[PDB]
Symmetry: D2
């Protein structure tokens, strides 16, 4: 059954060298459960955990990775709603104290004692990884653990963002960055939730991919010069809600100018030092909200995975082996990324 | 009854010279009603209508003023829910087309055809002024038309702002600029709505005035250096909702750093070229919303006037004569303002 | 252009005899607009206006009918957002005082001075009928005025009901009475809004029609005995929101027993003396809400017509002539109804 | 420190004989914490747990009681946000599986595996009792554990009920049963939350008590015959939200007739076989909601205790000894109850 040693990609100092080597198998605490992580997505947050450029101190030595779909192989003692052989998911937020005000309200991510898998907890870039039983995702049985792994971070983040834009069905939503990664998952979640997706991206074959996943209007930010005017025209007044899955400060600032009066602008990405300099007079005189959206609680996880489990959203991935890390890390530092990159822990 | 000529303070060109002289008595259209404006507040928006520095073009020649409490002396033809001798109020938003999407949703202020009394409509700085019957405020009988006049713009703006911070009773609210004008009315509305008012202002006798109107915690922004730390300490994590009644860009930017995780920051003032440069990473990672709030619809008017009509909020004013305009205009351009300045139209 | 005499179906006493005869052409007041009603739906509310069995007193003599799609042929004087040749729609609520608390809040239907077209106002069973310009529906250009006429009452009522069940996308909704009239329009609106429609109806060819308009689960209330158990099984706990488009007291009472804990039960129909006897202990211990839903405001009209104008909902009708009234009235008194019955005013 | 045997009031069969005798000291599980219950309120739910008349099966032998304020004397192993000597509170809902859909959404009370302290868990009628660490209340330090004990069930139930009536500040709330037990706590919570409390109760000295705790209007249901007309008069249209803390079916049915159009009627009590037979036509035509409200989650506990900890709500109690049980049980079966009855576990 559970071995005494597994193979993980561990690094010992910030921005250091990633070693795919044998490490011990963790011991599930009385609240945690052990997960034979089958696959695990890789995303920019793993770069930011590697470098350590974010304020929160990173635990070291660290097995990064926070989008890990796997099988429950043995649990803790108080673990209640879980069985062995159940599929589980390691998300960004591994666990919280569940006694603080935020955990009680539902926003466990704002917990001061938040355990961030792959940042301050042994993440999912290993074969066997532990995850708090309360927060682990209840991936249904029979789902492709390869495809759901990117949905564990990008899908749950964009489901929360589209629920944070206070949109109603039929309302225009403008996904700034609407093809690739968070953008395409946001387009599919918005289309499944009822909204009328407008997309703002550019490059080769972006518009046909966008139309394929069910987008309504596509503003090519290369061909088109005035994006704000194009969005105000296509939406007939402005997008009812904007989802800024593009961390560039210019796009973020522009999204406050094509969002409808009384419309919401959700910021999803976490840049290093970006600022949302928005004209205060225009934001006041048009009653525009500029919301920020973090990972999303257990209800948003349940509902995003339930959208996935109906074939409504699909995550085209590229599966590689766990040993291909850190070629993915060094490839991601430059910008040679396309879609989502899943790693298989066995390979 | 209704004369054929009244005395108003009218100017003929932007930033020009204000003439307190005889002008005609308006004719109420079939939707409008004529109001013997008894008193009328003066506020910074009247400076901005005078200069014309805002984007929207000002009608000229113009009798400014948009906080006018008065008596209904004759109405139009389709005016339905009004009688003669009824008290009415001229607010910023005079009327809208009531057929556009926004008017239907409730946000009449975002109407493209919004009639802005004192900007694109003969305002309330005259004896007799017309106002759309749908939008005019239903000032109850027996109220002091001198005191309710400032409540027609500052009170209704801060009631909307505190309803836009999505606060619940017992939640901390931090009124940045919590003494004088919008600030003290916001403190009284917040205290009447249930919130626990924190105040951030400085000067002489500001803290005692604040405590008098029912404030809980007062951070003196002159004595105290680190305001953010003081608010995080007093509120035990941050204010649940911030109301930025101080248009300074530094205070606006700081208010995004002492608002609670999952907390809202309402921007109330309309500066000329201010920007709310907020750290995108912090706003995302803490799920902070930055809402803007405009005048407020007819329901917010009904409810703000209903709070006033219970003696819960009180507007200490300085009553002058209508002939004292434009000494108030030139006094306001410099910054010799304190509290609210009401003008009596008879005097 | 506008004639001086048209042909309408008018009756002079409650439950009397309906006379398809020549009547005058109304004169649009300064707020109203005249509509060459092209088509007009017929629904049970017209029976209830005919009999007069409802509490509110019916104006007599009365041209009933309240789902009238037509062309704006001449308007009033203050009518602002309208042109000639524009398509308009006469809904149940013709107009309100727009100065009362309810009109201000958005719920114009609760106005004490509500003008109910076809009950206390010359309805849409005539060629030319007047309707308040604020409340008339803004039917887009090019839409089939025959098909949108049933959407003016059933579609707008079920869009409001599904927005009153506080559902989120992916939540189960159970349309009790899910084929025919309000039921099929509710199924199509629920499917377009994102919910997962469960249907509860019985008869011939009901399930295939249901599947055609996009239903997910169909409980045949003839084949199946325990409906509550079947819904709890299909929904995995209960429907998140129930829409009771079947006025039978047994179905209404059962819908409080298969709605999810913390779920909503919207009552749409207006029976004569039905009661919703719900077990108080079960409703408390499961936090079940039992909402009622009326016609729906101008925003719900705009949004329901916008769903229709995307081909998302479709109203299969039977078009007859206006002279076929009152054969439809006497046919409807018995129960020989199927789908929706539109009348053409020219024929 | 922690003894090996304490004194509790335990019964061994439904409706049997209550024995105040020595029982063992429980062992806190790895999630639970042990509480030296200092005081404990007694309420009708304890009668219903004793008789066993409710559907859910009662654990036997059982130490009832579910409003127990006490001191944390030793905790479990994974208990995170707790220290020794901390004040804790045993509420109705002792713990849930925290992996089900409801627990995730926030409504832990609807959990199928809900542990109901004093029904299916050793309650708080003993000296030392265990309670799940996640759900136990965080009673602040220095509070009178005698007074907060009734607030642990009645206060948290009425805070949830007033938050379930979707009221805004200044809206009328009508507490049907507005003096004694749930009623007076609901009056104080409603007054602290901002609403304008109307009260409906009768007897000696009820109106003066009501006025003392901050009620606005009191309809004496003995002197007054038409309660509905009196409430519609006092509220000027109906109460915006009704709180039915009186389980009588006649009062519940009447509360659906004096609640405002678009108003909410919260049912708080859990009778044995009561039904809320409401006129469906009136509920539809006025858009009235009839919500039910259960215990309330950890956020509602935090916020109700935070209202208590500001001296805004006060619970006048009668403290007796734990040995006086079951004289309180047999006294409560008849109806010789007044206010709240706290038992001291030491005495
Ligand atoms: Zn926590
Ligand atoms: Zn990620
Ligand atoms: Zn308009
Ligand atoms: Zn003003
Ligand atoms: Zn009205
Ligand atoms: Zn109809
Ligand atoms: Zn649970
Ligand atoms: Zn209790």
């Amino acid at each position: 059954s559970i071995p005494e040693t597994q193979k993980g990609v561990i690094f010992y100092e910030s921005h250091g060298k990633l070693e795919y080597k044998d490490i011990p198998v963790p011991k599930p605490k009385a609240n945690e459960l052990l997960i034979n992580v089958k696959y695990s997505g890789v995303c920019h947050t793993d770069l930011h955990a590697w470098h350590g450029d974010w304020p929160l101190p990173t635990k070291l030595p660290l097995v990064g990775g926070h989008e890990g779909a796997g099988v429950v192989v043995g649990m803790g003692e108080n673990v209640k709603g879980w069985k062995i052989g159940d599929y589980a998911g390691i998300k960004w937020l591994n666990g919280s104290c569940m006694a603080c005000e935020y955990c009680e309200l539902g926003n466990e991510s704002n917990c001061p004692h938040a355990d961030l898998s792959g940042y301050t907890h042994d993440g999912s870039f290993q074969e066997y990884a532990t995850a708090d039983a309360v927060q682990a995702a209840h991936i249904p049985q029979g789902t492709d653990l390869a495809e759901v792994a990117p949905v564990l971070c990008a899908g749950i983040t964009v489901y929360k963002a589209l629920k944070s834009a206070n949109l109603m069905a039929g309302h225009w939503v403008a996904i700034s960055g609407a093809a690739g990664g968070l953008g395409s998952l946001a387009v599919q979640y918005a289309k499944a939730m009822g909204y009328r997706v407008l997309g703002i991206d550019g490059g080769e074959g972006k518009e046909e991919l966008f139309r394929s996943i069910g987008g309504e209007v596509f503003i090519d930010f290369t061909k088109e010069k005035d994006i704000v005017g194009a969005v105000l025209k296509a939406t007939d007044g402005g997008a009812h809600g904007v989802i800024n899955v593009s961390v560039s400060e210019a796009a973020i600032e522009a999204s406050t100018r094509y969002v409808r009066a009384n419309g919401t602008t959700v910021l999803v990405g976490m840049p290093a030092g970006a600022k949302c300099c928005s004209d205060v007079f225009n934001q006041v005189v048009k009653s525009i909200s500029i919301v920020g959206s973090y990972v999303g609680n257990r209800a948003d996880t349940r509902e995003a995975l339930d959208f996935f489990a109906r074939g409504l959203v699909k995550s085209p991935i590229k599966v590689v082996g766990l040993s291909t890390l850190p070629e993915i890390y060094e490839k991601m530092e430059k910008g040679q990324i396309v879609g989502r990159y899943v790693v298989d822990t066995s390979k």
